[PDB]
Design a protein around this ligand. Structure first.
Ligand SMILES: Cc1ccnc2c1NC(=O)c1cccnc1N2C1CC1
Lengths: 555, 412
DNA sequence: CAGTCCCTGTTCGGGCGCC
RNA sequence: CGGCGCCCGAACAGGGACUG
């Protein structure tokens, strides 16, 4: 008989399946003789057992290596058993963001020893565990065994651990509403606004409650260690910061250097305001080999520069104060890049960040702002569970004009104006009605699918015509092309009639920037005009100068 | 100690494994206090990692209500029981419900909490209450009684319902009673005072039969259909004839007797857009024959029970929204328009949310079925706030569209 | 009535960043 | 071996327009 620590989880098996039987695959020769003994150790502690007849089960060994260890750690591979074991609802849903933590007067960390081996495996599943691995080289054929606890690299080890642990902490928590625990892996972090000694009181009284279930918590544990080091973070009860970032100054630039660079910049971007990755992100476009050679452009270096000066001085985030409003203010950084800061007391930030993402073939600043505001609301709900008040570089009239005209449903939550140039503007508007006494251009363009060849041109009410031959083009491009013509050749006010539903869709959504140089040009002309009314009619309905245009362009 | 109708996820498919979306602290609190109270009542109970299934949950306040209602998005579960409920037990849909001078919707879902649930099925009601900032892990439950918003819940409670209602239905044979999910639709042609009284009376029926019921009135006899209509004009600019002809071409996708031929010839030269062009008579007669073809009913449009309904919504500006319900393109079972809804002139997502709800409601009152929406909105926008404006106990099916407007002219 | 193209617009498998 | 953030490249849905 062994003994019985803590409530067990009913692990089942994927219906219509049974335990694995496998041949061994290579692992290094020196250290593995050690586990032959180590196995006998576990025999006495309750972590292993065996039976001869009853196990049709066998498992191999394949591993991954870790830096920074002063002693060696044994391991076993259930990968075949893994693939054969029921799925769980995973407990690690991701991690809290430091900026989301409420400020706590006292914060300690207990580290659980024998954490995984401190948890009882499901009685009946215990059977499925049996495994075998080479002695030193080998001598006699061998022997085998089963696991009585949570096995390394098994799925339920993390799920069931986390849940069991949770169950244990629950009564302590309920008897202690104002303590605050958070569990990451095998570490617990406790905190309170109580006084320093009654705090250490509850720290031991909890090591008690953990012990009563058999969870060992040593005293190398440190109140005298915070800042705590967690996932790139440095955490003090009062303030948090990213762990220190090293930016390569290397003269030799390979695309993989720029990659690691960028990753470092974004991670910096959660705290250091105003990080721009754009040109560095441009280098990465469409490269075949990760080892290729690339030079830095003046832009990418000027960015790298401004960024180096941002990283120069250090900085820290505060924590969240639920009593006070959340404030998110966004500044336009240009070239479709955006930055935002989220703070509560002015000039003290919880966090910063970028929104650089260019969405769509043709877009504009209002849209991009709307998007950033959305990204940011989401981030705010995950972290603080509420939406910030927004401070935005856009006139309430600008915005009102946009959202109220746009065909899609669109919205920004409660927000106010900040005059912090550059201000976000709409660079042109199309008229809602035809313009009297403006010349009227009927436009067309056409291309032939086979020859990829075509022409773009127009006819007007004034008698004015044009047809321009064009090479290596498409039907869409010619229709854009014709509108471009009508713009270049027209005065400050103009009505343009197009039968291209495509082109009309683009211009009508009022883009200020495009991937397409031609659209960019159309845009530039659009911005130069005083009044532009752009209309659509169906093709080959014999309409207007379009039947006339159609003949001339289609000829 | 009563029976339990076994239930099965229809063949081949597993339990819903869908992720819980982040909640606001407001709503996480309301859910926590509701589930802890519901645990105490043994309605639901805690679960482990051995249950790998999930349905999303959130909370809402019904229209003009300050009380938090829990709401589960059972759509994936509802699909695999979809076959359970649809093939096994049917609810005949009153074609008269729509003809009532009034229809009230009472929320009877609480009743479902009486009945036990098949013990083998319960692992499929699994839901996580999320935590702010991932501070705690999720609080996970599963359902002991008949879970609200699942379609099996009104299916299994069918007998009991027909029972509790039969006194009233018998005593009041002329009142029409429909049941769609957690909601019961009760309607009558009675003058409104005594209607509201008969509703109070029914509230009493379920009250003394062991039910609680946390305005709801509708007016289906007054529901109007939006016809397509060409403008009445004195003088036509070129631009007028152009917009006319193009619109006319679309409408002719719907009604085939339309001809643009003579109006097209009206557009012949290259003329200034704003020039005023007189209408030839042959075209004038073609146009008038068109306004005519546009007052009739579209050939061959009738509801087909087997097909899903589809609703399309267009944003028309200044608070107006147009919609169309159809099972096949261009054959519309209904077209309509909304204006000055809550959110008008300030929040589009709120207005659209409202719209989706009114459309779903008529869709249920009319075919006893919720439509699948094509929503004129970006995906991300919608997901974020729609969760904020929702007052309904059900959740339609939706997908997202971008349609720069040439179909917008379902309105002037 | 099929079968070709040109646009635009989310989903899924390939490297950095944080464990 | 695994999640998250991002960037990079490939496969499907909507729409347009041509081949008799
Ligand atoms: C890494 C971590 C993750 C989540 N929460 C905490 C911590 N550790 C802290 O350093 C911490 C710091 C300040 C406030 N709360 C903290 N705590 C919470 C327990 C009071």
């Amino acid at each position: 008989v062994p003994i019985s620590p803590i409530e067990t989880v009913p692990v089942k098996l994927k219906p219509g399946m049974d335990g694995p039987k496998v041949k061994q695959w290579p692992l290094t020769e020196e250290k593995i003789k050690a586990l032959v003994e180590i196995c006998t150790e576990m025999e006495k502690e309750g972590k292993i057992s065996k039976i001869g007849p009853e196990n049709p089960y066998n498992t191999p060994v394949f591993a991954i290596k870790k830096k920074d260890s002063t002693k060696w750690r044994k391991l076993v591979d259930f990968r075949e058993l893994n693939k054969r074991t029921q799925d769980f609802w995973e407990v690690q849903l991701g991690i809290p963001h430091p900026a989301g933590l409420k400020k706590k007067k006292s914060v300690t960390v207990l580290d659980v020893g024998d954490a995984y081996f401190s948890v009882p495996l499901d009685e009946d599943f215990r059977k499925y565990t049996a495994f075998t691995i080479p002695s030193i080289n080998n001598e006699t054929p061998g022997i085998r065994y089963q696991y009585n606890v949570l096995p390394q690299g098994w799925k339920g080890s993390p799920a069931i651990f986390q849940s069991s642990m949770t169950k244990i902490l629950e009564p302590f928590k309920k008897q202690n509403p104002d303590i605050v625990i958070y569990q990451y892996m095998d570490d617990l972090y406790v905190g309170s606004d109580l006084e320093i000694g009654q705090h250490r009181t509850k720290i031991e009284e909890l090591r008690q409650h953990l012990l009563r279930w058999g969870l060992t918590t040593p005293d190398k544990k440190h109140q005298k260690e915070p800042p705590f080091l967690w996932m790139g973070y440095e955490l003090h009860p009062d303030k948090w910061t990213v762990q220190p970032i090293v930016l390569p100054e290397k003269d030799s630039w390979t695309v993989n250097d720029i990659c690691k660079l960028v990753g470092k910049l974004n991670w910096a971007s959660q705290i250091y305001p105003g990080i721009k990755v754009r040109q560095l992100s441009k280098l990465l476009r469409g490269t075949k080999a990760l080892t290729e050679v690339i030079p830095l452009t003046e832009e990418a270096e000027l960015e790298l520069a401004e960024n180096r000066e941002i990283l120069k001085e250090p900085v820290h985030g505060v924590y969240y104060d639920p009593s006070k409003d959340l404030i998110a203010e966004i500044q336009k950084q240009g070239q479709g890049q955006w930055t935002y800061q989220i703070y509560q007391e002015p000039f003290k930030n919880l966090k910063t960040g970028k929104y650089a993402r260019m969405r769509g073939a043709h877009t504009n600043d209002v849209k991009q702002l709307t998007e950033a505001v959305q990204k940011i609301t989401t981030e705010s709900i995950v972290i603080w569970g509420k939406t910030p008040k927004f401070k935005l570089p856009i006139q309430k009239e600008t915005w009102e004009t946009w959202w109220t005209e746009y065909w899609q449903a669109t919205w920004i939550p409660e927000w106010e104006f900040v005059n912090t140039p550059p201000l976000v503007k709409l660079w042109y508007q199309l008229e809602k009605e035809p313009i009297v006494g403006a010349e009227t251009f009927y436009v067309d363009g056409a291309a032939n699918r086979e020859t990829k060849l075509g022409k773009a041109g127009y006819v007007t009410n004034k008698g004015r015509q044009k047809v321009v031959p064009l090479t290596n083009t498409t039907n869409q491009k010619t229709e854009l092309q014709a509108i471009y013509l009508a713009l270049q050749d027209s005065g400050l006010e103009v009505n343009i009639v197009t039968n291209s539903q495509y082109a009309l869709g683009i211009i009508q959504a009022q883009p200020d920037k495009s991937e397409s140089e031609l659209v960019n040009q159309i845009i530039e002309q659009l911005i130069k005009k005083e009044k532009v009314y752009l209309a659509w009619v169906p093709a080959h309905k014999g309409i207007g100068g379009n039947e006339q245009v159609d003949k001339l362009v289609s000829a | 100690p009563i029976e339990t109708v076994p239930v099965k996820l229809k063949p081949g498919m597993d339990g819903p494994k869908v992720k819980q979306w982040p909640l606001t602290e407001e709503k996480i609190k309301a859910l926590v206090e509701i589930c802890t109270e519901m645990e105490k009542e043994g309605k639901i109970s805690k679960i482990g990692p051995e249950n790998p299934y999930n349905t999303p949950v959130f909370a809402i306040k019904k229209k003009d209500s300050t009380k938090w209602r829990k709401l589960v998005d059972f759509r994936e579960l509802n699909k695999r029981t979809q076959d359970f409920w649809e093939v096994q037990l049917g609810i005949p849909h009153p074609a008269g419900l729509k003809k009532k001078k009034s229809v009230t919707v009472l929320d009877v879902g609480d009743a479902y909490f009486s009945v036990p649930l098949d013990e083998d099925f319960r692992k499929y009601t699994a839901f996580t209450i999320p935590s702010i900032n991932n501070e705690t892990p999720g609080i996970r439950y599963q359902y002991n009684v008949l879970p609200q918003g699942w379609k099996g819940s009104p299916a299994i409670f069918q007998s009991s319902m027909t029972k509790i209602l039969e006194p009233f239905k018998k005593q009041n044979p002329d009142i029409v009673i429909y049941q769609y999910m957690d909601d019961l639709y009760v309607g009558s042609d009675l003058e409104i005072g005594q209607h509201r009284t008969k509703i109070e009376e029914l509230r009493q029926h379920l009250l003394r039969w062991g039910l609680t019921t946390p305005g709801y009135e509708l007016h289906p006899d007054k529901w109007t259909v939006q016809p397509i209509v060409l403008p009445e004009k004195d003088s036509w600019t070129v631009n007028d004839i152009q917009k006319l002809v193009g619109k006319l071409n679309w409408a002719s996708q719907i009604y085939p007797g339309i001809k643009v031929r003579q109006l097209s010839k009206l557009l012949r030269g290259t003329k200034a857009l704003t020039e005023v062009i007189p209408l030839t008579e042959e075209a004038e007669l073609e146009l008038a024959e068109n306004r005519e073809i546009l007052k009739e009913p579209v050939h061959g449009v009738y509801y087909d029970p087997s097909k899903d309904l589809i609703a399309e919504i267009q944003k028309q500006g200044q608070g107006q929204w147009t919609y169309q319900i159809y099972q096949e393109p261009f054959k519309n079972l209904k077209t309509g328009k909304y204006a000055r809804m809550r959110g008008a002139h300030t929040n589009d997502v709120k207005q659209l949310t409202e719209a989706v709800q009114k459309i779903t409601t008529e869709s249920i009152v009319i075919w006893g079925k919720t439509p699948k929406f094509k929503l004129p909105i970006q995906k991300e926008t919608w997901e974020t706030w729609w969760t904020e404006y929702w007052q309904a106990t059900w959740i339609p099916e939706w997908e997202f569209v971008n349609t720069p407007p040439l179909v917008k002219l379902w309105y002037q």
